Design a protein around this nucleic acid. Structure first.
Ligand SMILES: *P(=O)(O)OC[C@@H](CO)CCn1cnc2c(=O)nc(N)[nH]c21
Ligand SMILES: [Mg+2]
Ligand SMILES: [Mg+2]
Ligand SMILES: [Mg+2]
Ligand SMILES: [Mg+2]
Ligand SMILES: [Zn+2]
Ligand SMILES: [Zn+2]
Lengths: 906, 114, 69, 106
RNA sequence: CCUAUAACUUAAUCU
RNA sequence: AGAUUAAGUUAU
């Protein structure tokens, strides 16, 4: 009782109060990174072998310091004392006190002045985030002075979009995380010099940074100890950019009170600084780190090193990144061209083919000089734009352009006809909710300012490498590789050629002006050189239900030409495949919607339906996931491209559609990240990203579940093998990648179209935690995608008689068609009526073009006739009567033609 | 055929950007470099004689371009003229907290390098 | 009903846009704001007040004679 | 161009709203408003009165009716900033005419 | 100024 | 039945 409490004090003479009663242990619910032969994973368990004592302050107030008394056995007691005597001189080791006390003489291990939570509690709270179940995260935030306790009274406090002050609140933890990193390096040095072998886990280090568990440590010859730090650093890696742990490295002498380091403006390399950062904070990470990813061995090595570069590039100044320019002489007349590029992710890349003296310019080298933004920015004015927080390179013209968006044109004859037919009554189910919203002249830069949601995000690299192997299995059936210039298929040649090529013609002029040999020479040039390109932002005039402006990205003709020649074989092979997971290219007509849904419900045993939402998907997508998506597509080029060619194609795609220079209103800006909407590979890379986040949610579901309570022994062995393949094994285990893929295809059946997804999943496994659910997606999007996904944007359908709730903004009904029941897609009737009532040209409200327009809208509006709601069905009959009224005011008007569009015989 | 027109237009545009180019403060930074190779983001930051500041409200104006001369990018910039969103010439006497609701925000000030 | 004033707002803003009212960005910004908030209004009393405030922009300048109508 | 202007007033005259009709009638007689009608709790409105007979029908005292609302008059200037009291208005001193009224609503 | 990809409809030529 | 051009509609 009191005597035991006195013994715990010891030489410290600290005022203790017990958290438990008497001499019995105190049971806590903590998060452990455990790997046994019994269980594995990063889950929450019960810790029952410790007595906890809180230390009072001078005024008798409770402080963060705790005394943890652990009783296990005699052999662990003697072994831990033997390890501690070797490790006691290290300041990163918490002070241990070994004694025995008579409760019957059980031995005790007393750890002194620990915090309440370990580092694994912080990592688990940020990596498994739940609103309303974040008490551990709240206690950590109010304990270490990140925010007051009334900060959580503000609603949407956790939301990155609704409240960007949570980034500052989380950045208040970064200094403690950096101190824990330095103390881990000190502990590893002390283990190596003393000859001790053991794994480092996150639950054995407290939030002060001190290490305290040695039960699994074994002794060896001194000078040759090996610490294992893969699980530690890999599970900790998202927190390093969430809390911004390396912020103090920007300052002089790494001192937060000191000012910033004033780097040289002409400095771009930062290679030795990257190596110094890697040796300072990740010294015992075993895999080789290349600061410049041009020296990497394969694409997995590119992923592994580009992950360290997003962390280390937050230290360096933002004027060093982007194109590296060099003066060259053309016929003695000097130019300023780009001879390289400095990436945040890939390091410095230098161009291989560059001449200092050229005596004539061909069409191809004129094209790469016109496309290059170096000439455009070296001639323009300096720009300081304070409307946005994005980086501003230069203003090309002396004015600032202020583009507005016009309102829609009203189609009064159809509205008068619809009012005469009984539509738009008071209290009716169908009302107009889709309009053309006008925008004022500040709309373009306000839409560009939504790239502040894109943050530098470090990934769990071991988890990402396993996930990219599983993601690769989905794209296996497709064929790909390079093609020649004559095999390239262009859909529309009279479209914009981007900037600065839209001053001289459309895409047809450049396709007709270059021969096939010039196009192939340009494509070969991008395999050894990096061409930086400028992307034009254009406001898009189209109907919507929200008043937010929408911008499209216009990519240059050089980038889209070489990207077509690199990617089109794989993209056509994806679009021309039925029955697969990615359903891009599959029509909803002629029974195709029914075939897509039948395919999604393949072998799920206890089937439920699930769909989710990506908040700010084009904006907030991390650069590591976009690079990962690009690498997966480029895995078809194994026999036509070398590794240097594939790296330079990756560097060209990163310099063109990931972090390119963006021209928004006559002025150049730096794109932080995200996806350009005008690249050829956008929908397909979005499909790879969607499959990646789903596989990550399933992995985090299977590893965070308690292994002792998994009833099926196959799933328990699968969770054990999952932890082994993530954190213990370094090489790819293709047999377990096949086994986990088959498990996913059996219990988590997907249907992917470019960030839109429907999942048929086993419900019993999801309630047991063996497959992912909405909560796992919310956690993964929080720690990985830097957004908060509310459960109101998600849906769940427990009755598969009714279809998915929404997919590509179409609902689903079960319809008796002929002798059987099929699934029919129907749209929202507000959208159909708004398309008929509001048009974007004054030439679409007469009897000339409006017949074929209304036919197309009646084709899309036909399946509303099977709806039980009467006004929903009357929408199609209204469009039919109006097609008649247009047909006699100068085979479609008959209803049978529309039915033929949804019956399975094509 | 039409190849000649677009190649002459590309050649003509690319050459008059060198008539616009500063060519003497550009050389002082292009030859102070270790490998004759400098980042692009510092080229208009240290060489461009004209600066344009787009200012959304009055607080940004008093924090950024208060006075006739202001300091940005470790340089000295003297305002030449200010225009509004409708591209009408604003005088500095009009930019005050009293007359701030009557102006067409943003204002685009233009400052030469002193 | 509500749909009539939501369509009349569209007609009125295209009328204002034909009269080059976007020559002044201050007037065009609040015209765009009033039009966008009529099109998002739920109560019809809220939509009518904005309609008055937006129609007075047309009745301000002398470019469309109402005497003829 | 003008067909959009005719289709406006044929559907403005079908909403049958008193406030819209009140300002369209006032505009028809030349009693147009210089600025935008505010709909907040209290803000400023400038109304131009062409001549006397359309002034008595709107103003009787310190309150005039506009857009089915009441606006209390603060200042009357006439083709200058020639401030004129409120006791001036009668037919007895009619030659004693583009006139501005700057008021505030409740 | 007006992007990318996919599907569908209509019209007109050659087969 | 297939290809080409032009136009349109929907989806992302
Ligand atoms: P969806 O509209 O919900 O898609 C999200 C989206 C990001 O804007 C990415 C899909 N995407 C990419 N490029 C696109 C484009 O040019 N047009 C549209 N409608 N969607 C695009
Ligand atoms: Mg432990
Ligand atoms: Mg242990
Ligand atoms: Mg989205
Ligand atoms: Mg959808
Ligand atoms: Zn590498
Ligand atoms: Zn290839």
């Amino acid at each position: 009782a009191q005597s035991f409490l006195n013994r715990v004090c010891g030489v410290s003479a600290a005022r203790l109060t017990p958290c438990g009663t008497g001499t019995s242990t105190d049971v806590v619910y903590r998060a452990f990174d455990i790997y046994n032969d019994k269980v594995a994973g990063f889950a929450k368990f019960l810790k029952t072998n410790c007595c906890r004592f809180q230390e009072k302050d001078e005024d008798d107030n409770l402080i963060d310091s705790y005394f943890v008394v652990k009783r296990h056995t005699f052999s662990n007691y003697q072994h831990e004392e033997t390890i501690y005597n070797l490790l006691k001189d290290c300041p990163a080791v918490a002070k241990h006190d070994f004694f025995k006390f008579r409760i019957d003489m059980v031995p005790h291990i007393s750890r002194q002045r620990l915090t309440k939570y370990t580092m694994a509690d912080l990592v688990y709270a940020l990596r498994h985030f739940d609103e309303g179940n974040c008490d551990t995260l709240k206690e950590i935030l109010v304990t270490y002075n990140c925010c007051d306790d009334d900060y959580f009274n503000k609603k949407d406090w956790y939301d990155f979009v609704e409240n960007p002050d949570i980034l500052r609140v989380y950045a208040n933890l970064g200094e403690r995380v950096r101190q824990a990193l330095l103390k881990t390096v000190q502990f590893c040095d002390a283990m190596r010099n003393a000859g001790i072998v053991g794994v480092l886990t996150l639950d054995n280090q407290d939030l002060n940074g001190n290490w305290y568990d040695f039960g699994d440590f074994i002794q060896t010859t001194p000078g040759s100890g090996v610490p294992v730090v893969d699980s530690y650093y890999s599970l900790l890696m998202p927190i390093l950019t969430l809390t911004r742990a390396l912020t103090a490295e920007s300052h002089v002498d790494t001192d937060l009170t000191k000012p910033y380091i004033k780097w040289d403006l002409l400095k771009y390399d930062f290679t030795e600084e990257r190596l110094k950062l890697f040796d300072r904070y990740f010294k015992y990470w075993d895999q080789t780190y290349h600061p410049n990813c041009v020296n990497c061995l394969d694409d997995r090595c590119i992923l592994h090193c580009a992950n360290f570069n997003v962390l280390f590039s937050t230290v360096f100044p933002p004027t060093s990144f982007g194109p590296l320019v060099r003066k060259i002489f053309v016929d003695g007349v000097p130019f300023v061209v780009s001879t390289g590029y400095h990436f945040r992710e890939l390091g410095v890349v230098h161009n291989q083919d560059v001449n200092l003296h050229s005596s004539r310019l061909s069409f191809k080298e004129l094209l790469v000089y016109a496309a290059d933004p170096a000439m455009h920015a070296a001639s323009g004015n300096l720009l300081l734009d304070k409307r946005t927080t994005c980086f501003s390179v230069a203003a090309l013209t002396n004015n600032v352009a202020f583009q507005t968006v016009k309102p829609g044109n009203f189609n009064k004859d159809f509205y008068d006809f619809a009012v005469s037919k009984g539509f738009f009554k008071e209290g009716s189910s169908v009302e107009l909710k889709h309009f053309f919203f006008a925008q004022d002249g500040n709309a373009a830069i306000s839409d560009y300012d939504y790239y502040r949601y894109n943050l530098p995000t470090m990934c769990d690299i071991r988890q990402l490498l396993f996930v990219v192997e599983v993601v690769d299995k989905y794209f296996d059936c497709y064929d790909g590789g390079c093609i020649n210039a004559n095999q390239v298929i262009v859909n529309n040649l009279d479209k914009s050629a981007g900037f600065p090529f839209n001053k001289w013609g459309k895409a047809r002029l450049y396709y007709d002006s270059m021969s096939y040999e010039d196009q192939d020479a340009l494509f070969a040039y991008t395999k050894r050189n990096v061409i930086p390109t400028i992307t034009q932002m254009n406001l898009k005039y189209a109907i919507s239900a929200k008043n937010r402006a929408r911008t499209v990205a216009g990519v240059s003709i050089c980038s889209t030409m070489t990207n077509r020649q690199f990617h089109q074989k794989l993209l056509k092979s994806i679009a021309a495949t039925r029955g697969a997971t990615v359903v891009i290219g599959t029509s909803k007509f002629y029974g195709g919607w029914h075939n897509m849904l039948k395919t999604v419900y393949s072998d799920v045993e206890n089937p439920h339906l699930m769909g989710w939402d990506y908040p700010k998907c084009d904006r907030a997508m991390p650069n590591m996931l976009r690079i990962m998506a690009s690498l997966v597509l480029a895995r078809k080029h194994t026999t036509c491209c070398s590794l240097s060619h594939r790296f330079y194609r990756l560097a060209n795609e990163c310099a063109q559609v990931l972090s390119e220079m963006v021209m928004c209103g006559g002025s150049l800006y730096v794109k932080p990240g995200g996806t350009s909407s005008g690249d050829a590979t956008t929908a397909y890379a979005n499909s790879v990203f969607n499959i990646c986040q789903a596989v990550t949610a399933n992995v985090n579901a299977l590893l965070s579940t308690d292994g002792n309570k998994i009833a099926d022994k196959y799933v328990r062995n699968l969770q054990h093998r999952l932890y082994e393949c993530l954190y213990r094994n370094r090489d790819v285990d293709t047999d377990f990648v096949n086994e986990f893929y088959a498990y996913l295809r059996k219990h988590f059946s997907m249907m992917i179209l470019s960030d839109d997804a429907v999942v048929c999943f086993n419900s019993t496994y999801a309630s047991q935690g063996l497959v992912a659910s909405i909560k796992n997606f919310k956690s993964v999007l929080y720690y990985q995608n830097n957004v908060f996904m509310s459960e109101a944007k998600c849906w769940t359908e427990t009755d598969l008689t009714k279809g998915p709730h929404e997919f590509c903004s179409q609902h689903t009904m079960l319809v008796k068609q002929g002798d059987d029941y099929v699934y029919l897609p129907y749209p929202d009737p507000s959208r159909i009526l708004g398309a008929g009532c509001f048009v974007d040209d004054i030439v679409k409200t007469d009897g000339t073009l409006m017949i074929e327009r209304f036919v197309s809208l009646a084709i899309d509006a036909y399946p509303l006739t099977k709806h039980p709601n009467q006004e929903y069905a009357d929408v199609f009959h209204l469009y039919l009567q109006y097609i008649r009224k247009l047909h006699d005011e100068l085979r479609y008007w008959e209803p049978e033609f529309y039915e033929a569009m949804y019956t399975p015989h094509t | 055929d039409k190849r000649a027109k677009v190649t002459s237009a590309m050649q003509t545009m690319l050459f008059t950007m060198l008539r616009k180019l500063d060519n003497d403060a550009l050389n002082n930074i292009i030859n102070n470099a270790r490998d004759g190779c400098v980042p692009l983001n510092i080229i208009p930051l240290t060489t461009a004689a004209k600066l344009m500041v787009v200012i959304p409200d009055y607080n940004t104006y008093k924090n950024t371009c208060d006075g006739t001369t202001f300091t940005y990018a470790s340089a000295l910039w003297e305002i030449q003229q200010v225009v509004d969103a409708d591209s009408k010439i604003v005088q500095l006497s009009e930019i005050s907290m009293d007359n701030s609701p009557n102006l067409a925000w943003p204002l685009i000030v233009t400052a030469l390098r002193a | 009903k509500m749909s009539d004033v939501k369509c009349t707002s569209v007609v009125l803003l295209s009328v204002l846009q034909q009269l080059r009212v976007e020559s002044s960005s201050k007037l065009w910004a609040q015209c765009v704001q009033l039009h966008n908030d009529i099109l998002l209004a739920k109560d019809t009393t809220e939509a009518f007040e904005k309609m008055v405030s937006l129609l007075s922009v047309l009745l301000s300048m002398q470019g469309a004679v109402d005497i003829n109508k």
